[PDB]
Amino acid sequence: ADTIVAVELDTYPNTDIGDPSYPHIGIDIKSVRSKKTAKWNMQNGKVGTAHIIYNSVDKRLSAVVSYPNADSATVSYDVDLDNVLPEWVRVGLSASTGLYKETNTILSWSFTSKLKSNSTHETNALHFMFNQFSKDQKDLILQGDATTGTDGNLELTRVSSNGSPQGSSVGRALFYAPVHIWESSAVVASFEATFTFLIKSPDSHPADGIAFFISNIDSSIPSGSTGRLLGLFPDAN
Amino acid sequence: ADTIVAVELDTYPNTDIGDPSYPHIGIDIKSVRSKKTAKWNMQNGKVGTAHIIYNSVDKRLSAVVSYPNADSATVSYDVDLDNVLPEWVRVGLSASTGLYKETNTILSWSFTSKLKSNSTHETNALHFMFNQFSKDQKDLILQGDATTGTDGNLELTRVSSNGSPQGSSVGRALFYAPVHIWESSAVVASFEATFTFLIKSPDSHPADGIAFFISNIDSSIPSGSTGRLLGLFPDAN
Amino acid sequence: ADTIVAVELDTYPNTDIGDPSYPHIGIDIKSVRSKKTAKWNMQNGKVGTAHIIYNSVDKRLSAVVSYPNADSATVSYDVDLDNVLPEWVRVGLSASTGLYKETNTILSWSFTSKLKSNSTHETNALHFMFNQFSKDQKDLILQGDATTGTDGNLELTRVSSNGSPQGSSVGRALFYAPVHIWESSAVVASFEATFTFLIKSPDSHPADGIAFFISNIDSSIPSGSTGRLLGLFPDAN
Amino acid sequence: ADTIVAVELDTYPNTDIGDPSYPHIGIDIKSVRSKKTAKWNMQNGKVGTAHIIYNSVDKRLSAVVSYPNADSATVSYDVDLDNVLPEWVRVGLSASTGLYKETNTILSWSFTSKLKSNSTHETNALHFMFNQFSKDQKDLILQGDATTGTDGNLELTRVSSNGSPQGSSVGRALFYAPVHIWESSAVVASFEATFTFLIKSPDSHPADGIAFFISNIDSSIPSGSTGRLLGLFPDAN
Numbered sequence: 001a002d003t004i005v006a007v008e009l010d011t012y013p014n015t016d017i018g019d020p021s022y023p024h025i026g027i028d029i030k031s032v033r034s035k036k037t038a039k040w041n042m043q044n045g046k047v048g049t050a051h052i053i054y055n056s057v058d059k060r061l062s063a064v065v066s067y068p069n070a071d072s073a074t075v076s077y078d079v080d081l082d083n084v085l086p087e088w089v090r091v092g093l094s095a096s097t098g099l100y101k102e103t104n105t106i107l108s109w110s111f112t113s114k115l116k117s118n119s120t121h122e123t124n125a126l127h128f129m130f131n132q133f134s135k136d137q138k139d140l141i142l143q144g145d146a147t148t149g150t151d152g153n154l155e156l157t158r159v160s161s162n163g164s165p166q167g168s169s170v171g172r173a174l175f176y177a178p179v180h181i182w183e184s185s186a187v188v189a190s191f192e193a194t195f196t197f198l199i200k201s202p203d204s205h206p207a208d209g210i211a212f213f214i215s216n217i218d219s220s221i222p223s224g225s226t227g228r229l230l231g232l233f234p235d236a237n
Numbered sequence: 238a239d240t241i242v243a244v245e246l247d248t249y250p251n252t253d254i255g256d257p258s259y260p261h262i263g264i265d266i267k268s269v270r271s272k273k274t275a276k277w278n279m280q281n282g283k284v285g286t287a288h289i290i291y292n293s294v295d296k297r298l299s300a301v302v303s304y305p306n307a308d309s310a311t312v313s314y315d316v317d318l319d320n321v322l323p324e325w326v327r328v329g330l331s332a333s334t335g336l337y338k339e340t341n342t343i344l345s346w347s348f349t350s351k352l353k354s355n356s357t358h359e360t361n362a363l364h365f366m367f368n369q370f371s372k373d374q375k376d377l378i379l380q381g382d383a384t385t386g387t388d389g390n391l392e393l394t395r396v397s398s399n400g401s402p403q404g405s406s407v408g409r410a411l412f413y414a415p416v417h418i419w420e421s422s423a424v425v426a427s428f429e430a431t432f433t434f435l436i437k438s439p440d441s442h443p444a445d446g447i448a449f450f451i452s453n454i455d456s457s458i459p460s461g462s463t464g465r466l467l468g469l470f471p472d473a474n
Numbered sequence: 475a476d477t478i479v480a481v482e483l484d485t486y487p488n489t490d491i492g493d494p495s496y497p498h499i500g501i502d503i504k505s506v507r508s509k510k511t512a513k514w515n516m517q518n519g520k521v522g523t524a525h526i527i528y529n530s531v532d533k534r535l536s537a538v539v540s541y542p543n544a545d546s547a548t549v550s551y552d553v554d555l556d557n558v559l560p561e562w563v564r565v566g567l568s569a570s571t572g573l574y575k576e577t578n579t580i581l582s583w584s585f586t587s588k589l590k591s592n593s594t595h596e597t598n599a600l601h602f603m604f605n606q607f608s609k610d611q612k613d614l615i616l617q618g619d620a621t622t623g624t625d626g627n628l629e630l631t632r633v634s635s636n637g638s639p640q641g642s643s644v645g646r647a648l649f650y651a652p653v654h655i656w657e658s659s660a661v662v663a664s665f666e667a668t669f670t671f672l673i674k675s676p677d678s679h680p681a682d683g684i685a686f687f688i689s690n691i692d693s694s695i696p697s698g699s700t701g702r703l704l705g706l707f708p709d710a711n
Numbered sequence: 712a713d714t715i716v717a718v719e720l721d722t723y724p725n726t727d728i729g730d731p732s733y734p735h736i737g738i739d740i741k742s743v744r745s746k747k748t749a750k751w752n753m754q755n756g757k758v759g760t761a762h763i764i765y766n767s768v769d770k771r772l773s774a775v776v777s778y779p780n781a782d783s784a785t786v787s788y789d790v791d792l793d794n795v796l797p798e799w800v801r802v803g804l805s806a807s808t809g810l811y812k813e814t815n816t817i818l819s820w821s822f823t824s825k826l827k828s829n830s831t832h833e834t835n836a837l838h839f840m841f842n843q844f845s846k847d848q849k850d851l852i853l854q855g856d857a858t859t860g861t862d863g864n865l866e867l868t869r870v871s872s873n874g875s876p877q878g879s880s881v882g883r884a885l886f887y888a889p890v891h892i893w894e895s896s897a898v899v900a901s902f903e904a905t906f907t908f909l910i911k912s913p914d915s916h917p918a919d920g921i922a923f924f925i926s927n928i929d930s931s932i933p934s935g936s937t938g939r940l941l942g943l944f945p946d947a948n
């Protein structure tokens with residue numbers, strides 16, 4: 001199956017699969033059952049920002065989610081991505097709705113990856129930044145119900161013309177080019193991702209969440225992965 | 238056919254297609270017959286550097302080629318890429334040999350593209366940098382006789398195991414992801430490319446050259462592109 | 475005296491010193507009498523953006539000023555900065571009011587300078603970016619009535635507590651560190667600056683303008699440079 | 712006194728002040744007696760590279776020193792710089808010789824600092840990169856015996872015309888502009904530094920070392936800080 005490493009912004013507490021009883025951010029290493037979580041005071045209708053960082057020196061994947069004039073939620077987990085992910089991967093954003101729903105709108109997204117090898121001055125780097133999305137964004141691979149163009153934003157899940165989010169939706173957006181996330185001769189490897197989102201929902205319990213993920217190049221939405229599975233995993237194991 | 242815009246480092250003077258009677262750099266807008274050229278004192282066996290720049294404000298495509306402790310060749314041409322190229326393109330490097338030959342080795346390559354839109358703070362950017370190439374470089378589309386891995390270098394054309402360049406060779410390397418080179422609402426669009434090369438022939442006259450090009454997404458080596466056509470054009474018109 | 479090279483956003487037409495009879499942007503090379511101008515449809519109370527670019531290859535200084543959902547004004551001028559400016563300079567922003575006034579608010583400012591030398595891979599670079607200013611901004615040299623901290627903005631000229639701009643005001647802000655603007659050994663030397671501003675006047679007819687300038691390291695506000703002189707020149711010659 | 716935070720590349724083991732009995736890299740927080748060290752297999756006459764990184768999310772200062780075709784030494788230390796350093800500081804390089812000596816040559820140096828604020832898209836950044844130093848480097852504050860120009864290198868300590876390092880030497884180089892290393896409102900604060908050095912010694916026992924340091928803006932070489940104090944501390948407490 002696909003190998004997934006993700007940072008989830010889980011808005012709906014699914015107690016049967018191990019979710020805390022409140023909105024939270026978590027680090028998922030090949031399983032929807034987060035390796036570590038942190039309470040997140042999600043703000044309905046407000047624009048938030050997520051920062052994901054990682055470096056091979058201290059092998060720690062960290063994430064911070066904040067809103068203006070509000071405290072930030074933080075979560076970290078020590079993990080050596082060399083032993084989890086293949087050398088070449090694709091990075092993307094995923095989101096879903098189930099019985100309950102919310103808009104999973106991405107306003108901007110940027111990513112940076114660097115491989116600084118042993119040889120003096122032998123750096124390989126990739127950097128992209130979208131501050132507005134086009135109707136025909138040829139450098140993104142859109143899967144599921146993901147669409148671009150609506151107000152220059154990226155809608156991961158389906159929203160009606162009147163702006164109402166729909167349930168039972170799932171969508172993803174991966175950057176077109178494969179990323180060389182790590183290599184053996186690298187002295188220092190690292191990546192950094194940032195995205196701003198707008199989760200708006202009429203429900204008392206918005207669902208299901210957004211997630212930044214890294215996967216094998218040919219990753220695709222596992223069947224029936226709407227709702228609690230965030231479009232990333234085929235089952236809840 | 239393909240739409241090509243290229244900066245050629247022409248090492249062999251083909252007088253029948255308009256080449257000056259000496260090595261030169263030139264701006265090719267949809268034709269192997271350069272719109273403007275400049276004498277280039279090519280140095281066999283030495284590592285050179287090429288810098289290509291362009292911006293929509295003053296619509297001028299410029300290039301500079303230099304060698305350490307040597308003068309640089311420069312060429313410029315006013316051209317509005319909006320009227321020549323499609324919004325989405327692919328960028329790459331091309332090279333060829335014919336009756337005569339040379340090594341068309343690329344030691345490093347970097348590219349940066351930015352679209353500063355009308356909407357304040359709405360910048361879109363792409364940046365990649367290869368300071369060493371891998372045997373399996375999944376973010377490059379290699380066409381023709383192009384290969385990577387050899388000393389961490391990109392060999393656009395065929396070289397034997399003993400290092401000897403072969404004639405009648407043609408090869409290209411395009412970056413995997415499509416680049417949004419321009420758009421109607423962009424207040425400023427621009428790009429910059431840089432690469433270092435090592436051209437060396439054991440014969441009297443080297444041939445045929447290296448070229449940085451921008452083309453339609455699905456561009457492919459035209460048949461008969463060997464020799465004077467530098468793997469870019471189907472004919473000499 | 476000081477050596478000034480500036481891109482002015484002139485809001486008040488001073489016909490005696492050569493100003494066109496309308497708001498305009500212009501390139502000033504050591505004189506308040508612009509070498510080249512362009513009509514600018516200034517929008518009172520709206521946030522605009524200015525982009526200044528320059529590169530030694532095609533020796534052309536260009537500027538673009540735009541507002542969201544509006545056309546942009548553009549002006550260019552061929553000039554070899556090597557012959558005008560000293561190798562080391564300071565970059566900054568200047569503004570003034572005279573009999574009439576306006577707010578000269580800077581919301582953000584970024585600058586990038588690069589020197590690619592003859593020796594392969596030998597690049598020197600400087601880059602700063604302020605998206606919000608602090609009350610104690612130690613990396614800026616504030617001259618005249620310039621202050622920071624008010625809403626995280628830079629006020630080049632004096633504005634009252636109630637937000638009203640004052641006349642007869644002049645202020646500047648230079649980046650603390652000297653910039654190596656050019657050097658003889660460079661193959662390519664280039665810079666790019668961007669800033670967003672908010673010009674507003676209740677009197678309905680604003681004066682005098684804002685300007686991005688490059689000068690000798692020890693530059694200071696010439697005596698009596700309020701009004702038409704934009705705080706850059708000592709006289710109107 | 713000055714507040715110093717430094718990563719030392721200690722070549723001479725001073726057992727009385729706590730040095731291990733071999734060359735090592737260490738994290739010094741306000742004291743020459745490192746908080747944590749790591750064995751470093753220094754290679755006389757070879758060019759090495761140092762990478763220092765830090766981020767406020769996981770508050771860990773890490774360093775890696777490597778040589779081509781050789782293992783790298785690594786050292787990390789959890790420390791919240793907010794509680795140690797003032798908001799505004801200066802960054803620099805320091806080096807010294809004592810009874811024994813070595814050349815403390817810096818071939819290149821780059822630094823990047825970013826303050827990601829709570830408010831969406833509010834980022835402040837500073838970045839400089841020197842790949843060659845000039846005889847008159849106006850953006851560096853040279854203290855002690857530090858000089859630039861010699862082959863486009865930075866010599867932290869005194870070396871004779873014939874290239875021989877001298878003992879009892881101490882020199883520093885700080886970047887001209889103050890750096891906003893942190894602020895309360897920042898969601899993420901981080902910095903990264905990289906430099907390549909060439910430590911060559913005539914004898915089989917080099918001394919004393921090179922260090923990347925962060926200090927209060929007005930920092931200066933302490934009296935009698937030659938040798939084992941690396942030009943950073945006034946005493947060995």
Ligand SMILES: Cc1cc(=O)oc2cc(O[C@H]3O[C@H](CO)[C@@H](O)[C@H](O)[C@H]3O)ccc12
Pocket residue numbers: 012014097098099100101207208226227228229
């Ligand atoms: C007990 C319960 C009450 C409720 O009000 O909604 C519920 C919704 C549930 O789950 C569904 O809605 C959730 C929120 O969309 C999804 O995570 C999940 O995949 C769906 O099966 C499960 C249980 C309940």
Ligand SMILES: Cc1cc(=O)oc2cc(O[C@H]3O[C@H](CO)[C@@H](O)[C@H](O)[C@H]3O)ccc12
Pocket residue numbers: 249251334335336337338444445463464465466
């Ligand atoms: C005049 C001449 C002399 C020669 O010795 O070889 C020659 C080879 C030529 O062309 C071939 O060799 C050239 C160099 O490889 C190519 O540019 C071209 O496409 C090939 O057809 C063209 C002319 C000559």
Ligand SMILES: Cc1cc(=O)oc2cc(O[C@H]3O[C@H](CO)[C@@H](O)[C@H](O)[C@H]3O)ccc12
Pocket residue numbers: 486488571572573574575681682700701702703
């Ligand atoms: C009295 C008067 C009437 C008028 O219509 O315009 C005037 C413009 C003046 O100019 C001053 O105000 C202008 C706008 O504030 C400045 O450009 C200029 O340098 C100042 O001297 C000064 C006086 C007048």
Ligand SMILES: Cc1cc(=O)oc2cc(O[C@H]3O[C@H](CO)[C@@H](O)[C@H](O)[C@H]3O)ccc12
Pocket residue numbers: 723725808809810811812918919937938939940
């Ligand atoms: C072997 C030796 C003999 C001696 O008489 O003094 C010595 C003094 C030393 O110390 C000085 O030289 C050392 C190496 O340069 C420095 O680390 C230290 O700060 C200096 O005081 C080191 C070694 C000796």
Ligand SMILES: [Ca+2]
Pocket residue numbers: 010011012013014019208228
């Ligand atoms: Ca859940």
Ligand SMILES: [Ca+2]
Pocket residue numbers: 247248249250251256445446465
């Ligand atoms: Ca030719």
Ligand SMILES: [Ca+2]
Pocket residue numbers: 484485486487488493682702
């Ligand atoms: Ca005027």
Ligand SMILES: [Ca+2]
Pocket residue numbers: 721722723724725730919939
């Ligand atoms: Ca020591």
Ligand SMILES: [Mn+2]
Pocket residue numbers: 008010019020026032034
């Ligand atoms: Mn969860």
Ligand SMILES: [Mn+2]
Pocket residue numbers: 245247256257263271
């Ligand atoms: Mn030609």
Ligand SMILES: [Mn+2]
Pocket residue numbers: 482484493494498500508
């Ligand atoms: Mn004017």
Ligand SMILES: [Mn+2]
Pocket residue numbers: 719721730731735737745
């Ligand atoms: Mn020590």
